[model samples]
Target chain A: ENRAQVAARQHNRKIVEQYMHTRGEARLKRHLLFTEDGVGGLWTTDSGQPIAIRGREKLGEHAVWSLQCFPDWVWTDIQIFETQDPNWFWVECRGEGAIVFPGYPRGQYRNHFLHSFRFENGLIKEQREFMNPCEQFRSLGIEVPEVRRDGLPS
Target chain B: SENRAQVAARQHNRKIVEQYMHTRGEARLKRHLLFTEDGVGGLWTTDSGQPIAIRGREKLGEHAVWSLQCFPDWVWTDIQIFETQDPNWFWVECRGEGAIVFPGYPRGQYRNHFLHSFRFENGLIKEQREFMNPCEQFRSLGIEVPEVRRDGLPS
Candidate 1:
């Protein structure tokens, strides 16, 4: 591999590794471009949506909070490819919080989700998360609001 | 701006493209060996062995048939944006137009589609994961289109 490819893979792996432990504070804003550097995501399950990340700082903070919220988060089936810009490798990953979040089990959902990652200068500037829209609930045989009689899905 | 054969050739290409598009549905069940059945992946799905769980192309074709049946007039047009070719991997980027209308949602409402990355194994496609932001495809269909997305973050 050439130096460019070497740099790409090295930085790429480092980003992936950071993701493994994503304590929020350590990897979130610290590595990315700070304020005004910007961060944005495009996702909608054709159902609901989020308020918006606003800034890179907020991005990391929420991410860290989110991870800590769903402790068992795991990333698998990772595949990374270089975009036209050598410094970027669009990443595709699959993950799930099989354990469910604190308020979760809302009708007992322990479903999986999909994730997309973008690495720029070795930091994630762009990210997207998706569930199979309504299909996810259907695939798992769950409901949209997931109302459970026992307060949890069977 | 061209001659007879030129129009014929363009017509022929359009015909093939339409045929290929149709193949994505019921014809899929007819079993197009033209597609590599195994190893398909999706950024949209987790790898329950295959990122895509159609149980290979046979099931995928059936799934497509079902979708087409559910929304028979649903149609999409995509233009290739970019592509990457690795040893055994080939990925493409695309932008497209789509519309899905039923009882409540209106018909012929064009949705903007951006396919981030779709990777292929060998000459056939083994994995393709795409995101389509029809969040009204963006209130872009021209109506007031005010829709708020609640994060739904497993909470």
Candidate 2:
């Protein structure tokens, strides 16, 4: 890669790291790095329907809910990988927090998150987050029984 | 501005994931032919809450067979794979649908979105990580898991 191209990639990676640390370590919102039209994708509804939220305002609303659930949440580990698109990158992070939610015992919750960021003009224009919810329920010792063919516990 | 070798590595890695997604059962494990002798792979985020990692080709092969035994009809669809600048690394998003006929567990149809990332070495898969939500699988199967929380608290 040329010098300028390499520099550009580094800049994007730095911005993403900053975004994570700001929201996590600093416990502050980094909405400045997110584009006004940015859309967050693939978050699931309660019934498990995948949904997308467009624009920063709606995205902030969703993020704020997370902050409420995990008041002390922070990114414990972050591993960033570069993709073919200079403006895009993949991130794997383990987030830990004292989670207080119904059904789940109020305790420290930890889960690995797989995230992708698409940048425009040095800011995030798109993002996707993936995590295994069952991991959390099982890790917390919740009884998630095996489902039978008839949709009942076997 | 990748070199010839890096570009080839990227394409080769991409093809491996694409073919692997379309395969099933024992035939799907054939893709492990590209795993290096010391390759490591498995679910980093599993529904069972148990770590499923293994090392070496022999052990990995056995693990593959064992997984098939649990979900004999497991098949992947709508795979969208991304080849990264790190030619040896790639990731994919897809849906896996199948029957969980494993004894002592769920015995029904299951489907869920899967996110998998692979790290390659010398054109062979050195490591693979699977990210999937078992809760989604349960909901899709129409199993009513007790909803202990709604809206996850408001900030």
Candidate 3:
């Protein structure tokens, strides 16, 4: 694989690993943190330590629901596209993933993007993001208030 | 020659008044109503008084927000155009003046747009949009949120 492909594979693997950890143990680890700027800025856990962005907040409600409902090890289609900028990449991923909540079904399709960097010495410096939870909700005919139950709508 | 200019001025003022009256009449016809498809498949006003073509509904809905906010006086300014697939189509970035907010506080200075599209019979408006600058508005208003939380409440 090319440099971009190599980077994309590494990035995707890291995301899956982080996601599993966050869901399984409900504990966030340090290597899981992926810091960057632009869009969502930096990755953080629910309690707020910077963590690798294995999942998105926009997709939080749906993803959490799915993780609780579906079993682990289900296969899903995921695509990674490399952009000209080494730091910018797009991943179009879809599949029936487990939900964190029991009643709600896991999302059938999910789309998200991640941008990262690798220093000459092999350290990742920055990253950024864009996610569409609203679209995901709409696709499922769910009407969530613009604001969350406890806070103002973002 | 001066007399002729005065007569021309009077005619222009009459035309403006007539246009204003026409718009008011149209506005009265549409008040607090949900529209749906008619037997002919056209969307009609609440009263079912007349059958409106799809193009008309598209245009009216697009302009109604500005009209409701601005009321009697509205002026569109700073129109920037963007090209689309259709040659007759255009999108603009415009601001409306004389606009008011209800329940009531500050008047809104909105940046909005009109996108015109052509139907087979005539050019119809396909979309109208008002751009919301929430981040800027929030910063200007001095708002803050908590960095992290379990209950999802922003501190």
Candidate 4:
């Protein structure tokens, strides 16, 4: 593969490791190294990484609070797949997870897809993601709230 | 004065026709039309479609099915726009046309947004889409799914 593709692959692998290991904090920190200051939000990997978005102070606080609401066993079976093209990759994980505290008593599975583009200098210049939570929640028998017409309540 | 207005209108019509013909010719020559099975299909034109190993086709199929299932009756409000100024990223928004079939369904009208960053070579799409709206999709399809918070926090 070309250098750009190789870097993109390694970046994807790290993301998988972070999420599967419950390393969201580290994953977010690692992500920050590549993001532009002020406008970017921190992302969590499968593994726990103790990192937060720079501007969204509330998101960081929420992260900490939510982490405390669930036990370690909830995070399991994390898998990351890197795309052959330099611009795409995804990570998937499953286990007993939920949105509410003391989350519903059932096994839950979740998956996330991330797309990253590597610059000529081997740094990630842009990233975007798609995720499937309902499938995870439904698999565990959880009823998610209905989406408002205006989108998530702000 | 009425005659002058008529002449101006004809000129405008001629310009529009010329532009449309040029656009049609370029689209025919440069546009890439891809089709695949629900999953693991290969890219092909409507006429020259081919089948490839399921590996890549599966990924695209999942995405297409998800789009159809999740956003039934989805309307595309405007044509997709991507400019070279911001080569790596762009956004598209549309009204879901109406009920349609997809991976998750019980479809209805929905608004859709597709934000993408593309990698191109020689003016062709190499790797274009990076993210999809699977979360809103599941909900639109009326599937009892889970909540994925924006920053990895449980909702």
**DockQ-derived CAPRI band for the predicted complex in model 2:** acceptable
- What's the C-alpha lDDT at position A77 in model 1? 64
DockQ of 4: 0.08
- On TM-score, the candidate that comes out on top is 2
Docking class for model 1 is incorrect
Q: After superposition, how far is residue B141 of candidate 3 from its true place, in Å?
A: 18
What iRMS does model 3 reach?
13.5
After superposition, the stretches of candidate 1 with alpha carbons farther than 4 Å from their true spots are A1-9, A20-36, A40-42, A46-51, A98-114, A119-122, A135-142, A145-154, B1-34, B37-86, B93-95, B99-122, B126-155
Alpha carbon RMSD to native, model 4: 15.1
Model 1 chain B: worst 10 consecutive residues (lDDT sum) = B41-50
lDDT of each: 0.45, 0.72, 0.33, 0.37
What fraction of the native interface does candidate 4 get right in terms of contacts? 0.12
TM-score for each of the candidates: 0.53, 0.78, 0.28, 0.37
**Best of the candidates, lDDT:** 2
The digit string of per-residue lDDT tens for model 4 on B1-155 reads 97675455444433432332233222322222222222122211111112122234335434444444444334334443322222322222222234544432343434333343333332223343323344444444564444434453443
- Candidate 2 lands at a TM-score of 0.78
Give the deviation of candidate 2 from the true structure as CA RMSD.
Answer: 4.7
**After best superposition, candidate 2 residue A102: deviation in angstroms?**
6.7
